[PDB]
Every structure is written in C-alpha cells, then in structure tokens.
Structure 1
C-alpha cells in the first residue's frame, strides 16, 4: 500500500483522536448554543473604518475603560430588514457566541441601539489575505497549503457541529501576528442538519448546486475551498469574468483550466474539490474530510501541529502597535448616526 502497516496504524489512531476531539467540541458548543456579554456604543472610541459592505462597516475601536482595541461590525437595522438578512444576522451572532476554534474570530460583545446592531470582535492587525495576495500576485504552493490546512481543519470543526460557513474568500481571512488565519464574517453561516435552500454567497465562490437553485449541503464549503486554493496559488480564481452571470455560466459548465506552474498533485486535488457531481466531490464521500486530509498534496502537512500552532508560518505581518492599521486599506469615513426613534424593534427582539 501507500503506507507501511505501521504508518497506517498511526494514521488510524490519529483519526480516532479526531473523533474524540470533535465529540468534546460538540458537547461544549451545545452547552453554549442553548444557554449563551453586552456593552454600549459610548464605551468605545471609534478610530478608523477597516472594511465596508452592503449593510454597514467594520471599525477599529478602542475600549475606553481597558484601552483594548477591537473590530466593531455595525449593521444598519433598516437595511437588514429590507432583505432575508434578519435571520442571517441572528445566525451570525448566535454561532459566533457558541463556537471556539483557534482559526475562528472571537466575539467579545454584542449590543443594539435604535438604529444599529453591533458585534465587537478581536482585532487582527495583520490585514486581509486578500490584500497580501493581490500585492504579491500569488502564493507558492507551500504557502497556499499552510493556509489551506487551517481552512480544512476549521471546516471539519464547523461541519461536525452541523454548521455550514458559506462565504469563504480571501476578503474574509485575516492574518494574525503569528501568520495564522482568522476566519471572519459569519453572516451566511447556518446550522443545517441536511439541506438548505437560500441563494447566498459570493459569485466566484458559489458551488454549481447553489446557482442551480438546488437544495444543498455542507459540500458547498468544500467546493469553495477548491476555489480558494486555486486563487491563492494562481492569483485569480478558476471562474473569472467581469459580470456575475458570466461567472455563473463558467461554474456550471464543469470545466476548469490550470496554470502551467500548478503541480500535478495540486491539479488532482482541485479536480476533486471543483467537482460538479456531488457523488464524486471530495469532502462529500464516505470517507468525509479524510479524502482531503490524506491527499498527496497535503502529504507534508502535520495536521496536529497546524492545530497546535507549532508550524512556522510563511509570512509574518509587520506590526507597529496594538492599534496599528497599516496593513488595511483606507475607506471613506461616514458619521455613525443613531436615531432618536427605535427602528425595527420587533424584528430584532432576539438579537
């Protein structure tokens, strides 16, 4: 076989240890999910906008009492109601409260006021993978692999809790002071025991079954991992066009082309992740995540060492101080206006 019978026994013991870990992690998650830390806006100084989206923005804030810096996501309640996003915003808060994993951003506070919802999370000063990747062009395969391994372990954790993530992309992956990945933006994360039906995500990263309005499962995250690995190693994603409709047509087609510098091991992995046929997609078969973890492209990956953060990272962001924003791009700064009248109170009773 590929492994001697001893190496095979080591791998087996390793896989049983994973099951033991995930069983404990489920017990801890459920304790928090059933029986869940507020603050208020004037407890923080607002420093700088770190990112912007349809419903609001993320701001660097400084907690007045402690001097700690955080990233505060601000959502305009009226804009959230205007869409099927009420449920999604409640999903994000509830999931972030309850999960615990080294590569998942930690939520510190949440609160709401007349106009907005607020989630205050750990500030990750190394910046988005997105801007490092766009600056350097593409990551070498070892560098991409180090990040990919952290996503594989994070999805193994989330999926074991019946959580789908649904928005993997470099924009949502921050680099910490040790060069490891922090996954952010749980706005589309959801507890799903079997299938779900919402058309949501980011065009370049959507699995075909989402685009085709089919009920879908956690395998959409494994497709998205294929897109991410391709983009990290190529510098651009596999289904690449100026308009969403053109992107969707490429995704459904069942065709991918690879740069000539991709190793054959990488291409083989990607053909099995970017697999339209769900009966053949890695991560969706009888052996589950182990088809990915045991793939040749990951043969050098020490999964436990990655989890334990023992591996030297390929890139350490420059860090000048705890509130330094030099690794983030600039955004237009807008006033944070709070209405004197409560908006959408009944819709957000549970937040």
Structure 2
C-alpha cells in the first residue's frame, strides 16, 4: 500500500491539490487573516509571524499584471475587462481577461469560471480558444488567452449583408465546435455570436464558457436555474427555472437555430422590447416564430431553422450530430466536414500588425471592507492559478 497515489494527485495539473493550488491555499489564507482586528487572536498572529514573510516573497516570483503591457481595452463584461496585452519578456501578444474579485463576491456569482478555465486550459482543440496562464492578485482573476484578431460574429453580421454561402460555413463551424464541447462531456448553454470569435484566418473559435456544465453518465444535467442570455435561450432551459428540469445537449442546437435565423433575416426570432417579452415568445415558439415575407430565404435554410426551433423531443440533433451534418442546407462545393477549417473562410481579416484591434469597438475604484472576524473573501479563488 502507497503514498504513490498521493504523489500522483499532486503532480496531475488537473487536480484540485496540485502544487499551485496548495500555494493559492496558503496565499489566500494569509490575505484573509492579515488585518489588525484578527491578529488580536494569538493563533492567527503566530501563524502570520511564521508565513507572512515567505508568502510575500513567493508572491513576488509569481506571474503578475505588471509583467504585461496593456496595449488597449477591447471588451468589458459585468465582472471586468478584456485587454489586448503584450508580455514584456516574450514580446508576445495575448488577450487578458480580468475578473474583479469584489464584483463576483458582491453579486454572489463566484464559481462560474472553473469550467471555463478547465476547457480553455486542456481542450487542446482548434475550436476552443486556448488559455496559457491563469493567475491572481488580491483584487482580480486573470486569464491570458490567445488573441482573436478577427473580432466576433456580432461585429461581422453588423458590417455585412450575409449570404447563405457564408451562413453555411459559419453555422457548420459552430456545429463542429459545439460537438467538440459535447464530446468533452459538457453542455455550453450560452451559444451566441458574441461568444464566437474569428481567428486570424477568418475561422471560428468559441471564446466564452462561463455557463458550461458537465453531463451525467446518461447525457443529461439536473439544473433548476435558467441560464444564458434571453434571445438565444431554449424553452426547456427557461422552463427549468420553476424546478426539476432535466435537459441534455439539444438545448445548444436550439441556440444554433436562433443564430442561423439571425444571420439570414437580420433580427432574432423572438425579439421583444422587454425581457419578459422575449421569454413569453420563446415559451410560445410554435405560435411566435415566423419569417418576414420580404427577407428572402432558401427552403433548405428555412427548414434547418425550424428543425432546430422546435420542442426538445423532436429537435434536430436529438439523435446525435450526424443528422445535422447531412441536412441539405450544408451541401456545397467549397468544403466537407473533415476539412472545413483549412478552406478559405468567407471573410479573411485585414490586419496591419500583431496589435491590430480594428475589429473591436472602442471603450471608455472598489475594495473589500476591512473585516472584523473572518469572512474568507479569497477562499472561492484557491486553485485558479495555472501555468502552461
């Protein structure tokens, strides 16, 4: 019998108790105890007298924000920003996402990133944006990701009248990407053009994974919270808010339908002035869906959309991705499914240099209160740090 299994767990970079997680655990403990009020406790003061000095030192050898140059800001979420950065020593360009620890604690939403980190770190797929380094300081999480200089599809669709030839391509790439995520045992749950980014050669990678979830042995989730963003959410996910909902990956294919509809027609199928408007339409989709007379659309395209926008029970892709691939809409002369991502994309970005952010739009003070007793504001972020 053996400490052989023990050693194994510590070296595995997927493990929750690898060396970097353990150092996060020691660092976070020191950050949460080192306040005048708490040091009135002998145990706490004595502990910190031993480790405070060495923990400062460790933190100095650690990757920091100051190791990067901020070239410019290219996106702002609810929890922080996305920066185009150049790492100083290597001189290489990355996209760095910052998540404010303050805003995540405050909004009670401080565990969404574990799946996103895992997927980007280890997917090793051309369809998934790659994470190179994850690190933290007392105020932020940082994810250093490969930069996608073609911008998102929400930007492509707003600069072009998209013909069907193009939609075949982009839809197919979304289909393969999602199938990749599903084969890693995960349902995306937030498929939309904002999370679809175009690489240098004009091909697509999925970029955000903050709503992902692991499936059961069977292929399902049990989830009682509706998630994703209103316009693209499926009826079964929305229904599951009320309690004991029980869905599989077919919820993502709904979102493909919404995406394909938007790309050809120019507006989302269930668009409405209000949130509760859009939700009321999605629920009543059998009656609310219809294409305007004038926006002219192929009968195969229209069919594919309707094959996606139906009840889970008969939705295209309930039997697996195979029936999606053979749908007549995808027939064309440029690409088959094994080679699509090495053919010429419909829009190749024009870039001047390795810091060209021209496909992103331009963009234009908050601390934890000092504690009394022990709040543990850093505990949710132990295990985040990762080096490639």
TM-score category by the smaller chain? 0.7 to 0.9
- 1:31-180 residue pairs with structure 2 within 5 A? 33=14, 39-83=63-107, 85-136=109-160, 138-180=161-203
User: Could you tell me which of 348, 361, 376 is aligned with 1:329?
Assistant: 361
Relative to structure 1, the CA distance from residue 202 to residue 86 in structure 2 (aligned partners, 3 Å threshold; closer, same or farther) is same
Extract structure 1 runs of 4+ deviating beyond 3 A. 31-38, 337-343
Structure 2 unaligned residues grouped into runs of 5+: 1-11, 21-61
2:221 alignment counterpart:
195
* Contact 1:128–1:170, Cα closer than 8 Å, also in 2: yes
Q: Which moved more, 1:103-112 or 1:75-84?
A: 75-84
Q: Which moved more, 1:139-148 or 1:191-200?
A: 191-200
1:237 alignment counterpart:
268
Relative to structure 1, the CA distance from residue 273 to residue 315 in structure 2 (aligned partners, 3 Å threshold; closer, same or farther) is same
Q: TM-score, normalised by structure 1?
A: 0.83
Helix, strand or coil at the partner of 2:305: helix
**Aligned-pair CA distance for 1:108:** 1.0
User: Could you tell me which of 298, 305, 314 is aligned with 1:263?
Assistant: 298
Structure 1 unaligned residues grouped into runs of 5+: 1-30
Alignment RMSD (CA, Å): 2.2
Q: Which moved more, 1:201-210 or 1:338-347?
A: 338-347
User: Could you tell me which of 308, 321, 324 is aligned with 1:292?
Assistant: 324
Taking the aligned partners of 1:118 and 1:160, their CA distance within structure 2 comes to 27
Larger Rg: 2
Q: TM-score, normalised by structure 2?
A: 0.76
**Aligned-pair CA distance for 1:203:** 0.5
* Contact 2:131–2:144, Cα closer than 8 Å, also in 1: yes
Q: Which moved more, 1:339-348 or 1:64-73?
A: 339-348
